[PDB]
Ligand binder design. Structure first.
Ligand SMILES: O=C(c1c(O)cc(O)cc1O)n1cccc1
Length: 217
C-alpha cells in the first residue's frame, strides 16, 4: 500500500563526540568558514583511498573513473552540498566512523581548545567532519561504497543520529554531505563566498573542484 517503506535506526553518539558537537554547534567562533576546507579535505582523503585501490585493481572504478569534488549551493532549500566520488562508506563505516566510536582525537581536540588552540586545527585531530555544525543545524550524509547499497546518515546533534537505506537518487560511488544551514549562515550559499574560501584554503587539493549553482525552476 505505501509508496515505500524502510527501516530507520537511531544511534546514540559516543559521549565525547556528543560533547564535541555541542561545543561546536553552540559556541561562537569568528572563522566558521573553515568547515568547507575540512569537508573538502575529507573528500580528498576518500578520493585518495579509492585511487589507491584502483592502482592494483582497476575494476574498483567500474562504479566511476572520474575522481572529483562538487560543491552545490541551493538557496531555495538553504543547503550547501559537498559531493565526492571517493571510496564511500559501508553501513558499518557510517555507524563506526560517524558517531559510535570516539577516536582519541575527539577528547584531545577539546583539550587543545581548552589549552588555547584554535578551532581551525580540528582536522589535525581527525574530527574535522563535525566542523559542519559551525554552519549547519542539520547534516545529512548520503554514501555509496563499492558492492554495498546507498545509505543516508543524519543528525541535528542533540545526542543521536539516524541511518537508513537511501534510494532517492543512486550515486555511482562516493559521499554527499548535505549541510542544512543555520539561518544566519546563508553567506555560504553565495558564489563569491564559496569561490573565495576555496581559493584561500583548498588550493593544494589535487582533484577538480566544481561549483554547481542549483535553482529549482
Ligand atoms: O566517505 C568518506 C567521507 C567523505 O567522502 C567526505 C566526508 O566529509 C567524510 C567522509 O567520511 N570517507 C571514506 C573514507 C574516508 C573518508
Amino acid at each position: 500500500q505505501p509508496m515505500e517503506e524502510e527501516e530507520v535506526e537511531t544511534f546514540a553518539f559516543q559521549a565525547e563526540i556528543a560533547q564535541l558537537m555541542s561545543l561546536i554547534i553552540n559556541t561562537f567562533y569568528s572563522n566558521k568558514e573553515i568547515f568547507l576546507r575540512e569537508l573538502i579535505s575529507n573528500s580528498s582523503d576518500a578520493l585518495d583511498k579509492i585511487r589507491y585501490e584502483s592502482l592494483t585493481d582497476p575494476s574498483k572504478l567500474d562504479s566511476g573513473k572520474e575522481l572529483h569534488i562538487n560543491l552545490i549551493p541551493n538557496k531555495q532549500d538553504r543547503t550547501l552540498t559537498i559531493v565526492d566520488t571517493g571510496i564511500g562508506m559501508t553501513k558499518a563505516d557510517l555507524i563506526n566512523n560517524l558517531g559510535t566510536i570516539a577516536k582519541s582525537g575527539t577528547k584531545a581536540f577539546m583539550e587543545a581548545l581548552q589549552a588555547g588552540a584554535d578551532i581551525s586545527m580540528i582536522g589535525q585531530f581527525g574530527v574535522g567532519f563535525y566542523s559542519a555544525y559551525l554552519v549547519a543545524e542539520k547534516v545529512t550524509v548520503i554514501t555509496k561504497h563499492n558492492d554495498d547499497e546507498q545509505y543516508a546518515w543524519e543528525s541535528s546533534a542533540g545526542g543521536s543520529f539516524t541511518v537508513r537505506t537511501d534510494t532517492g537518487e543512486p550515486m555511482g560511488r562516493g559521499t554527499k554531505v548535505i549541510l542544512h544551514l543555520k539561518e544566519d549562515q546563508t553567506e555560504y550559499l553565495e558564489e563569491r563566498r564559496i569561490k573565495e574560501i576555496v581559493k584561500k584554503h583548498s588550493q593544494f587539493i589535487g582533484y577538480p573542484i566544481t561549483l554547481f549553482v542549483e535553482k529549482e525552476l
